[PDB]
Design an enzyme around this catalytic site. Structure first.
Site, PDB file in Angstrom:
ATOM      1  CG  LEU A 121      20.330  61.035   6.126  1.00  0.00           C
ATOM      2  CD1 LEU A 121      19.157  60.453   5.351  1.00  0.00           C
ATOM      3  CD2 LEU A 121      20.432  60.396   7.500  1.00  0.00           C
ATOM      4  CG  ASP A 122      26.465  56.872   3.132  1.00  0.00           C
ATOM      5  OD1 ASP A 122      26.471  57.183   1.925  1.00  0.00           O
ATOM      6  OD2 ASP A 122      27.209  55.972   3.576  1.00  0.00           O
ATOM      7  CB  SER A 123      25.746  58.761  -1.138  1.00  0.00           C
ATOM      8  OG  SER A 123      26.803  57.862  -0.844  1.00  0.00           O
TER       9      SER A 123
END
Ligand SMILES: COC1=C(OC)C(=O)C(C/C=C(\C)CC/C=C(\C)CC/C=C(\C)CC/C=C(\C)CC/C=C(/C)CC/C=C(/C)CC/C=C(\C)CC/C=C(\C)CC/C=C(\C)CCC=C(C)C)=C(C)C1=O
Ligand SMILES: CCCCCCCCCCCCCCCCCC(=O)OC[C@H](COP(=O)([O-])OCC[N+](C)(C)C)OC(=O)CCCCCCCCCCCCCCCCC
Ligand SMILES: CCCCCCCCCCC[C@H](O)CC(=O)SCCNC(=O)CCNC(=O)[C@H](O)C(C)(C)COP(=O)(O)O
Ligand code: SF4
Ligand code: SF4
Ligand code: SF4
Lengths: 155, 176, 115, 85, 115
Positions: free
Chosen positions: D39-41
């Site tokens: 995922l992304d932050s």
């Protein structure tokens, strides 16, 4: 004959519309000042049947008098939408006509026609109150030449 | 020198206070306000009967742009482009090309009335009094495109209002 | 006989005028046309949320004031009695009590609007 | 009724599952978002938001970045409302 | 020389913190814009656009720059909250009326003389 009856009805309705053109208090810039001077005693809109009235719900003709900018254009379009039909737009001044002095600016609509369908183009910077009265009379003749019920009869 | 516009303390004599109370109860300045408007209704109205009566103007009035020409028939314009170079709104477009005879005249002279500011700077800049601001001001149009003037339309305006424009310049050229 | 015939005439004439006003002019309606009017730009969104009225005290005491005029109005027939002394005393009693009520409100803020 | 690590864990798994960018089968208690799920932050932002809104209490940003995997998620939401098995 | 004044944050991590909370505010807001502004795009269809706007300038690395766009995004959020932007102003983010532009060289060569 039916054509004569609908003709006479057209003349009556068009006469009413042209003889009680109620404009809107939508002055924007210096072109509004002349918009006031023809309301001043010298020219006196009132004798021609035209009386200023705010609240677009009860007005017919919009005299866009002044520069129409980007920040105001949504408001002008919305307010034009509030007007119940029939409606007419008179464009006063070069700025409201095609851009005027600030035609090449970054936040000026290059003509009020790009936002509403303008019906009468009154030129000037600012137009003389006589010239604006002439434009209003030209719009009056325009309403006089309408053929609504005739077209309905020849639907 | 300065004056105190509102520095008047009202007198507190019994007569003064009686008059103030009378004005309060029996509205007095209100009656004066009524009387002023009564006096002006009985006065003559200032409205003129347009279009049968026209408001006064001056020979210097700036209106519809027009291209003049010499009494011989040749146009005064020589495409020096001073008017195009001086217009604050860049409303003039000029393209020049040597005519068949040899005189330098505009192959295109368009003035955009929807962008013009009617300053009159062009008529001052013109060294041959070719472009002028005519006396006409009742030239409203139903469509936008009719306000984009061509060379032919401006020449037609010059040929139409020449009788007025020649007299107007004749009565004002000495001031310039 | 006469009064309801009148009332009916007015109400049917009004309802008719409404009918011709609302069916003849050949309306053409779209969503932005009936959009609420807020001096141009779209309204923030309300028109039914509570709207503070600072004369709430004044508004409510209007009810008592207008109530007293019910007691007051029989006076044109009350003057034509054989006991004018009692009638005068009682009428002045009502008026004096209304004056006292108004003065109490005036002194104890009362008529002054809230902020 | 009072609820314990079981209810916290199951609600965490639920409101982590409704996320579309999460994968149903790589989703696990040990599935670190950066490592397993990928995922992304910015995605972790609405992970912790799906935590807060259904869990009632808000969780600040001072601690949001620390919670990076469902165990830490469940542990933190356990120490918040005093869950001690 | 190489060292200059800071705007708000004193490192990239604090700038990322501010970006994170700005995204927090926008993500929480979006459905309120959809309802209040009477938008017709789906809620997700605005949240992903917020994500794309954040991802657009995801390449910047100067902290002061990051604080600058943090303030600018805060201002745009401020305009969106108290109905300072309107329906047209918000809809400008989804470039709707704009015809799609081509990316391959061949179509650009077919359409006009531009890079
Ligand atoms: C400092 O910079 C500023 C700007 O900087 C750029 C600005 O821009 C602006 C903004 C600019 C402006 C505001 C523009 C300037 C405007 C003005 C100066 C205003 C000028 C106004 C006037 C000249 C007009 C004022 C109006 C007056 C004096 C009177 C109006 C009163 C009226 C009554 C009008 C008429 C209206 C109505 C509705 C009456 C008509 C209706 C009837 C007669 C109905 C009759 C019907 C019947 C008879 C029915 C009969 C039925 C019958 C018999 C039967 C029916 C029964 C059946 C069953 C059918 C400002 C202010 C500014 O400050
Ligand atoms: C007392 C008043 C007596 C006179 C009343 C006249 C009322 C006229 C209302 C407007 C005209 C409507 C009508 O008769 O036909 C509409 C006719 C219908 O014919 P049409 O097919 O042109 O429709 C008009 C266009 N649309 C549908 C988009 C509105 O239109 C017009 O008259 C205007 C053109
Ligand atoms: C459309 C309707 C609603 C109205 C309109 C809704 C959109 C309005 C947007 C306004 C805000 C503005 O566009 C963006 C800003 O200020 S800042 C963006 C993030 N850019 C940076 O911070 C620079 C470096 N980038 C990173 O460090 C990584 O991108 C990341 C932050 C993800 C960390 O990732 P790591 O951790 O993996
Ligand atoms: S056309 Fe001239 S007078 Fe009218 S608003 Fe523009 S600049 Fe002012
Ligand atoms: S008077 Fe008209 S054409 Fe001449 S310079 Fe001014 S704006 Fe341009
Ligand atoms: S200033 Fe006069 S002569 Fe020169 S181009 Fe303009 S109209 Fe022609």
């Amino acid at each position: 004959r039916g054509e004569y009856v609908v003709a006479k009805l057209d003349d009556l309705v068009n006469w009413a519309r042209r003889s009680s053109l109620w404009p809107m208090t939508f002055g924007l810039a210096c072109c509004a000042v002349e918009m006031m001077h023809m309301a001043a005693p010298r020219y006196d809109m009132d004798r021609f049947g035209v009386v200023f009235r705010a609240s677009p719900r009860q007005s017919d003709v919009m005299i866009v008098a002044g520069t129409l900018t980007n920040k105001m254009a949504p408001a002008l379009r919305k307010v034009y939408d509030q007007m119940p039909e029939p409606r007419y737009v008179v464009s006063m001044g070069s700025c409201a006509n095609g851009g005027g002095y600030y035609h090449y600016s970054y936040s000026v609509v290059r003509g009020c026609d790009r936002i509403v369908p303008v019906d009468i183009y009154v030129p000037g910077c600012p137009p003389t109150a006589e010239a604006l009265l002439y434009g209003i009379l030209q719009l009056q003749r325009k309403i006089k030449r309408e053929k609504r019920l005739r077209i309905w009869y020849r639907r | 020198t300065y004056k105190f516009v509102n520095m008047r303390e009202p007198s507190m004599d019994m007569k003064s206070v009686t008059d103030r109370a009378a004005q309060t109860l029996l509205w007095t300045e209100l009656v004066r306000g009524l009387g002023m408007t009564l006096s002006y209704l009985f006065r003559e109205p200032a409205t003129i009967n347009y279009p049968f009566e026209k408001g006064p103007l001056s020979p210097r009035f700036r209106g519809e742009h027009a291209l003049r020409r010499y009494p011989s028939g040749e146009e005064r314009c020589i495409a020096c482009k001073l008017c195009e170079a001086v217009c604050p709104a860049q409303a003039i477009t000029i393209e020049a090309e040597p005519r068949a005879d040899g005189s330098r005249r505009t192959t295109r002279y368009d003035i955009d009335m929807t962008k013009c500011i009617y300053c009159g700077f062009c008529q001052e800049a013109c060294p041959v009094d070719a472009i002028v601001e005519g006396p006409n001001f009742e030239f409203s149009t139903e469509t936008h495109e009719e306000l984009l003037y061509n060379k032919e339309k401006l020449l037609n305006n010059g040929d139409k209002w020449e009788a007025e424009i020649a007299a107007n310049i004749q009565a004002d050229y000495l001031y310039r | 006989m006469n009064i309801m015939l009148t009332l009916l005439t007015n109400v049917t004439l009004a309802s008719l005028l409404v009918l011709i006003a609302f069916w003849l002019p050949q309306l053409n309606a779209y969503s932005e046309k009936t959009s609420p009017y807020e001096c141009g730009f779209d309204p923030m969104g309300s028109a039914r949320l509570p709207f503070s009225m600072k004369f709430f005290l004044v508004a409510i005491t209007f009810l008592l004031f207008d109530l007293e005029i019910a007691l007051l109005l029989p006076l044109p027939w009350a003057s034509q009695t054989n006991n004018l002394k009692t009638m005068l005393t009682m009428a002045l009693f009502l008026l004096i009590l209304l004056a006292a009520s108004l003065a109490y409100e005036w002194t104890q803020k009362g008529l002054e609007w809230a902020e | 009724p009072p609820l314990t690590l079981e209810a916290i864990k199951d609600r965490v798994l639920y409101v982590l599952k409704l996320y579309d960018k999460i994968d149903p089968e790589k989703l696990s208690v040990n599935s670190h978002f950066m490592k397993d799920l990928g995922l992304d932050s910015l995605d972790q932002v609405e992970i912790i938001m799906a935590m807060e809104d259904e869990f009632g209490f808000e969780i600040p940003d001072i601690d949001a970045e620390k919670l990076m995997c469902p165990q830490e998620i469940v542990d933190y939401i356990a120490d918040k409302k005093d869950v001690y098995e | 020389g190489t060292s200059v004044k800071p705007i708000f944050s004193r490192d990239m991590n604090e700038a990322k913190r501010r970006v994170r909370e700005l995204y927090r505010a926008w993500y929480r807001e979006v459905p309120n814009t959809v309802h209040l502004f009477q938008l017709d795009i789906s809620v997700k269809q605005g949240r992903d656009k917020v994500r794309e706007m954040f991802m657009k300038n995801a390449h910047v690395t100067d902290p002061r720059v990051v604080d600058l766009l943090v303030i600018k995004g805060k201002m745009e959020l401020e305009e969106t909250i108290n109905v300072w932007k309107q329906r047209t102003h918000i809809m400008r983010f989804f470039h709707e009326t704009e015809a799609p532009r081509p990316t391959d060289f061949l179509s650009k060569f077919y359409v006009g003389h531009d890079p």
